[PDB]
Coordinates of C-alpha atoms and ligand atoms in Angstrom, one line a residue:
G116 CA -18.7 16.8 14.2
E117 CA -17.1 16.3 10.8
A118 CA -16.2 18.4 7.8
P119 CA -18.1 17.9 4.5
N120 CA -16.4 15.5 2.0
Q121 CA -16.4 17.6 -1.2
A122 CA -14.4 15.1 -3.2
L123 CA -15.3 14.9 -6.9
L124 CA -16.4 11.5 -8.3
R125 CA -15.8 11.4 -12.0
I126 CA -17.9 9.2 -14.4
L127 CA -16.1 8.0 -17.5
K128 CA -17.4 6.8 -20.8
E129 CA -16.3 3.3 -21.8
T130 CA -15.0 4.7 -25.1
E131 CA -12.7 7.0 -23.2
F132 CA -10.4 4.2 -22.1
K133 CA -9.1 0.9 -23.6
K134 CA -8.1 -2.3 -21.9
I135 CA -4.7 -3.7 -23.1
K136 CA -3.9 -6.7 -21.0
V137 CA -5.0 -8.6 -17.9
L138 CA -2.9 -8.0 -14.8
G139 CA -5.0 -10.2 -12.5
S140 CA -8.2 -12.2 -12.3
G141 CA -10.4 -14.1 -9.7
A142 CA -12.5 -13.1 -6.7
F143 CA -15.1 -10.3 -7.4
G144 CA -13.5 -9.3 -10.7
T145 CA -10.5 -8.9 -13.0
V146 CA -8.1 -5.9 -13.2
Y147 CA -6.7 -4.8 -16.6
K148 CA -3.8 -2.7 -17.7
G149 CA -5.2 0.1 -19.8
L150 CA -4.9 3.5 -21.5
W151 CA -7.3 6.4 -20.7
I152 CA -7.8 9.4 -23.0
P153 CA -9.8 12.2 -21.2
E154 CA -12.5 13.8 -23.3
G155 CA -11.4 17.0 -25.2
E156 CA -7.9 17.3 -23.7
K157 CA -5.3 15.2 -25.6
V158 CA -3.4 13.2 -23.0
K159 CA -3.0 9.4 -22.4
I160 CA -3.0 8.2 -18.9
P161 CA -1.8 4.6 -18.0
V162 CA -4.5 3.1 -15.8
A163 CA -5.5 -0.1 -13.9
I164 CA -9.1 -1.0 -14.7
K165 CA -10.8 -3.3 -12.2
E166 CA -14.3 -4.7 -13.1
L167 CA -16.7 -7.4 -11.8
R168 CA -16.9 -11.0 -13.3
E169 CA -19.6 -12.9 -11.4
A170 CA -22.4 -10.7 -13.1
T171 CA -23.8 -7.7 -11.2
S172 CA -24.1 -9.2 -7.7
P173 CA -25.9 -6.5 -5.7
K174 CA -24.3 -8.0 -2.6
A175 CA -20.9 -7.5 -4.2
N176 CA -21.3 -3.9 -5.7
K177 CA -21.4 -2.3 -2.2
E178 CA -17.8 -3.4 -1.7
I179 CA -16.6 -2.0 -5.1
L180 CA -18.4 1.3 -4.6
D181 CA -17.2 1.7 -1.0
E182 CA -13.7 1.3 -2.4
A183 CA -14.4 4.1 -4.9
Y184 CA -15.9 6.3 -2.2
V185 CA -12.8 6.0 0.0
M186 CA -10.3 6.3 -2.9
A187 CA -11.8 9.5 -4.3
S188 CA -11.7 11.2 -0.9
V189 CA -7.9 10.8 -0.5
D190 CA -5.1 12.9 -2.1
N191 CA -1.6 11.9 -1.2
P192 CA 1.6 11.1 -3.0
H193 CA 2.0 7.8 -1.1
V194 CA -1.7 6.8 -1.4
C195 CA -3.2 5.3 -4.6
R196 CA -5.5 7.6 -6.6
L197 CA -8.8 6.7 -8.3
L198 CA -9.2 8.6 -11.6
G199 CA -12.7 7.6 -12.4
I200 CA -15.7 5.2 -12.3
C201 CA -17.4 3.7 -15.3
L202 CA -21.1 2.8 -14.9
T203 CA -21.4 -0.1 -17.4
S204 CA -23.2 -3.3 -17.1
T205 CA -20.3 -4.0 -14.7
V206 CA -19.0 -1.2 -12.5
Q207 CA -15.5 -0.4 -13.5
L208 CA -12.8 1.3 -11.3
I209 CA -10.1 3.3 -13.2
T210 CA -7.0 3.7 -11.1
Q211 CA -3.5 4.9 -11.7
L212 CA -1.2 2.2 -13.1
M213 CA 1.5 1.0 -10.7
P214 CA 3.8 -0.4 -13.4
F215 CA 6.1 -2.4 -11.1
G216 CA 3.2 -4.1 -9.3
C217 CA 3.1 -5.5 -5.8
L218 CA 5.8 -4.4 -3.4
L219 CA 5.8 -7.9 -1.9
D220 CA 6.4 -9.5 -5.3
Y221 CA 9.0 -6.9 -6.0
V222 CA 11.2 -7.5 -2.9
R223 CA 11.0 -11.3 -3.5
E224 CA 11.9 -11.0 -7.2
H225 CA 14.6 -8.3 -6.8
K226 CA 16.0 -9.3 -3.3
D227 CA 19.5 -9.6 -4.8
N228 CA 19.4 -6.0 -6.1
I229 CA 17.5 -4.1 -3.4
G230 CA 19.7 -1.7 -1.4
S231 CA 19.2 -0.4 2.2
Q232 CA 18.5 3.1 0.9
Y233 CA 15.5 1.8 -1.0
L234 CA 14.2 -0.2 1.9
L235 CA 14.4 2.6 4.4
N236 CA 12.9 5.0 1.9
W237 CA 9.9 2.6 1.3
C238 CA 9.4 2.5 5.1
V239 CA 9.3 6.3 5.2
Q240 CA 6.8 6.5 2.3
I241 CA 4.4 4.0 3.8
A242 CA 4.5 5.8 7.1
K243 CA 3.8 9.1 5.3
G244 CA 0.7 7.7 3.5
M245 CA -0.5 6.0 6.7
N246 CA 0.0 9.2 8.6
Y247 CA -2.1 10.9 5.9
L248 CA -4.8 8.3 6.5
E249 CA -4.6 9.1 10.2
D250 CA -5.1 12.8 9.4
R251 CA -8.2 11.7 7.4
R252 CA -9.1 9.5 10.3
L253 CA -9.4 6.6 7.8
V254 CA -8.1 3.2 9.0
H255 CA -6.5 0.8 6.5
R256 CA -7.4 -2.3 8.6
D257 CA -5.3 -4.3 6.1
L258 CA -1.8 -3.1 5.8
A259 CA 0.6 -5.5 4.3
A260 CA 3.5 -5.6 1.8
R261 CA 0.9 -7.1 -0.6
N262 CA -1.2 -3.9 -0.3
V263 CA 1.7 -1.5 -1.2
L264 CA 2.2 -0.9 -4.9
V265 CA 5.3 0.5 -6.6
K266 CA 4.9 3.2 -9.3
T267 CA 8.7 3.5 -9.6
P268 CA 11.3 1.5 -7.6
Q269 CA 11.8 4.8 -5.7
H270 CA 8.0 5.6 -5.2
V271 CA 5.4 3.3 -3.6
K272 CA 1.8 3.8 -2.7
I273 CA -0.7 2.3 -0.2
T274 CA -3.8 0.5 -1.6
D275 CA -6.7 -1.8 -0.8
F276 CA -8.9 0.6 1.1
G277 CA -12.0 -1.5 0.2
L278 CA -12.0 -2.7 3.8
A279 CA -11.0 0.8 5.0
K280 CA -13.2 2.4 7.8
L281 CA -13.4 5.8 9.6
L282 CA -12.1 5.8 13.2
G283 CA -14.8 5.5 15.9
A284 CA -17.7 3.1 14.9
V285 CA -8.6 -12.5 7.2
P286 CA -4.9 -11.4 7.7
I287 CA -4.6 -12.7 11.2
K288 CA -0.8 -12.6 11.2
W289 CA -0.7 -8.9 10.3
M290 CA -3.4 -8.1 12.9
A291 CA -2.9 -6.6 16.4
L292 CA -3.9 -8.6 19.4
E293 CA -6.6 -6.1 20.3
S294 CA -7.9 -6.7 16.8
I295 CA -7.7 -10.5 17.1
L296 CA -9.4 -10.8 20.5
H297 CA -11.9 -8.0 20.4
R298 CA -12.2 -7.0 16.7
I299 CA -10.9 -3.5 17.6
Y300 CA -9.2 -1.4 15.0
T301 CA -7.5 1.9 15.5
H302 CA -4.7 3.9 13.9
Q303 CA -2.5 2.3 16.5
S304 CA -3.7 -1.2 15.5
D305 CA -2.7 -0.1 12.0
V306 CA 0.8 0.7 13.3
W307 CA 1.3 -2.9 14.4
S308 CA 0.4 -4.0 10.9
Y309 CA 2.9 -1.5 9.7
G310 CA 5.6 -3.3 11.8
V311 CA 4.7 -6.6 10.1
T312 CA 4.9 -4.9 6.7
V313 CA 8.3 -3.6 7.5
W314 CA 9.4 -7.0 8.6
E315 CA 8.3 -8.4 5.3
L316 CA 10.5 -6.0 3.4
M317 CA 13.5 -6.5 5.7
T318 CA 13.1 -10.3 5.2
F319 CA 12.8 -9.7 1.5
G320 CA 9.3 -11.1 1.2
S321 CA 9.4 -13.9 3.9
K322 CA 6.2 -15.1 5.4
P323 CA 5.6 -14.2 9.0
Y324 CA 5.0 -17.1 11.5
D325 CA 5.5 -19.5 8.6
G326 CA 3.8 -22.8 9.2
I327 CA 1.8 -21.6 12.2
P328 CA -2.0 -21.9 12.8
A329 CA -3.8 -18.5 13.2
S330 CA -5.5 -20.2 16.1
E331 CA -2.0 -20.4 17.8
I332 CA -1.2 -16.8 17.1
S333 CA -3.2 -15.0 19.9
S334 CA -1.6 -17.2 22.6
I335 CA 1.9 -16.6 21.2
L336 CA 1.4 -12.9 21.4
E337 CA -0.2 -13.3 24.8
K338 CA 2.9 -15.4 25.5
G339 CA 5.0 -12.3 24.5
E340 CA 6.7 -14.0 21.5
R341 CA 7.2 -11.9 18.4
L342 CA 8.8 -12.1 14.9
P343 CA 12.5 -12.7 14.8
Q344 CA 15.1 -10.1 14.0
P345 CA 16.0 -10.1 10.3
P346 CA 19.7 -10.8 9.4
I347 CA 20.1 -7.5 7.6
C348 CA 18.5 -5.6 10.6
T349 CA 20.5 -3.7 13.2
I350 CA 19.1 -3.5 16.7
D351 CA 17.9 0.1 16.0
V352 CA 15.7 -0.9 13.1
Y353 CA 14.5 -4.1 14.8
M354 CA 13.5 -2.1 18.0
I355 CA 11.2 0.1 15.9
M356 CA 9.4 -3.1 14.8
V357 CA 9.2 -4.3 18.3
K358 CA 7.7 -1.1 19.6
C359 CA 5.0 -1.5 16.9
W360 CA 4.1 -5.0 18.4
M361 CA 3.7 -3.8 21.9
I362 CA 0.4 -5.0 23.6
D363 CA -0.4 -1.5 25.0
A364 CA -1.5 0.4 21.8
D365 CA -0.7 3.9 23.2
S366 CA 2.8 2.6 24.0
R367 CA 3.2 1.8 20.2
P368 CA 4.8 4.6 18.1
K369 CA 2.9 7.1 16.0
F370 CA 3.2 7.1 12.2
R371 CA 4.5 10.7 12.5
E372 CA 7.3 9.4 14.7
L373 CA 8.0 6.5 12.4
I374 CA 8.5 9.0 9.5
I375 CA 11.1 10.8 11.6
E376 CA 13.0 7.7 12.7
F377 CA 13.3 6.0 9.3
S378 CA 14.3 9.3 7.7
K379 CA 17.2 9.8 10.1
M380 CA 18.2 6.3 9.2
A381 CA 17.7 6.9 5.5
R382 CA 20.3 9.8 5.9
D383 CA 23.0 7.1 6.7
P384 CA 21.5 3.8 5.5
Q385 CA 24.5 1.5 5.8
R386 CA 24.6 2.2 9.6
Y387 CA 21.1 0.8 10.1
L388 CA 20.9 -2.0 7.5
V389 CA 23.8 -4.3 6.6
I390 CA 23.5 -6.0 3.2
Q391 CA 26.1 -7.8 1.2
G392 CA 27.4 -5.7 -1.7
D393 CA 25.0 -2.8 -0.7
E394 CA 27.2 -0.3 -2.6
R395 CA 27.1 -2.1 -6.0
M396 CA 23.3 -2.4 -6.6
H397 CA 21.2 -0.3 -9.0
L398 CA 17.4 -0.5 -9.7
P399 CA 15.5 0.7 -12.7
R400 CA 11.3 2.8 -25.4
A401 CA 10.2 1.5 -21.9
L402 CA 6.5 2.3 -22.7
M403 CA 4.9 -1.2 -23.2
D404 CA 1.6 -2.0 -25.0
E405 CA 1.4 1.2 -27.2
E406 CA 4.1 2.3 -29.7
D407 CA 2.0 5.3 -30.8
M408 CA 1.9 7.5 -27.7
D409 CA 4.3 10.1 -26.4
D410 CA 1.3 12.0 -25.1
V411 CA 1.4 9.8 -22.0
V412 CA 1.3 11.6 -18.7
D413 CA 1.2 10.1 -15.2
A414 CA -2.1 10.3 -13.2
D415 CA 0.0 12.3 -10.7
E416 CA 0.8 15.0 -13.3
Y417 CA -2.9 14.9 -14.4
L418 CA -4.9 17.3 -12.2
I419 CA -8.5 18.4 -12.4
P420 CA -10.1 21.9 -12.2
Ligands
LIG533 C1 -4.5 1.9 -7.1 C2 -4.5 1.1 -8.2 C3 -4.4 -0.3 -8.2 C4 -5.2 -1.1 -7.4 C5 -5.1 -2.5 -7.4 O1 -5.9 -3.2 -6.7 N1 -4.2 -3.1 -8.2 C6 -4.1 -4.5 -8.2 C7 -3.4 -5.1 -7.1 C8 -3.2 -6.4 -7.0 C9 -3.6 -7.2 -8.1 C10 -4.2 -6.7 -9.2 C11 -4.4 -5.3 -9.2 C12 -3.3 -2.3 -9.0 N2 -2.4 -3.0 -9.7 C13 -1.6 -2.3 -10.5 N3 -0.7 -2.9 -11.3 C14 -0.3 -4.3 -11.3 C15 -1.0 -5.3 -10.7 C16 -0.6 -6.6 -10.8 C17 0.5 -7.0 -11.5 C18 1.3 -6.0 -12.1 C19 0.9 -4.6 -12.0 O2 1.6 -3.6 -12.5 C20 2.0 -3.7 -13.9 N4 -1.6 -0.9 -10.6 C21 -2.5 -0.3 -9.9 C22 -3.4 -1.0 -9.0

């Protein structure tokens, strides 16, 4: 029925990597900024290390290891890569460092400097990663601006596959109606979440259905109400979002189609998004933490035999 998953899972010694700083904490564990030196080879890889805080909850480790399983099985430029696992007292996940953090945080913080070309490009890249997931038959089940991470301002990646599932077996506001009423998730249900994600970027990090109970939400959608058109948005871009939020899932557009549409728009960005002083704006020694290392390589340039 299915092809063998011959992904490699790499086990890392604790000595191989060092933790430099805490990016985040709370929930299952805390995630650290870090440096990883692989074995005999002399290279330094910037990593995000995530490890568990409330002891070794057996309940909890299934979630962390499932995340690792899914992450190892994916190889795509616009999907986040897991370098390794460290089997210490606490399970540790070593992932590629996305220096500029959360895409949601980024749009909010830099809204004044984010041009249409960047926005349309991000839309394209998310569609590409999500289409890749479709090829895999993996479903994100939780696509949001919060779950997209930015390696460079010109290069984002999808993340948070912990909840990810194979096709064919809470973020209510991002969820499709079919998902709300019947707990049904498909690639197409994923597309709807993609539409909400796009809306978040177009609104520069605004919150969808702000000050609405999730209890309300199903009725509203049943009512046929949807998110408002963003100021910056032309009707062409807004229509794409609307198609994503259609009740009939097969009616909704495919990720492969979404790649096509946004790319056309990316060709002539000012026609599809109108932003004050769009022409002016520019978006990003450098290497924080360590002074010592010019042996640093990105995870992306670091490949395995
Ligand atoms: C794929 C790698 C990965 C996963 C991940 O879960 N996080 C993450 C996301 C949200 C909160 C904490 C960690 C990653 N984060 C980062 N970088 C990062 C996180 C928070 C703030 C600032 C950041 O960049 C400097 N990189 C990869 C993550």
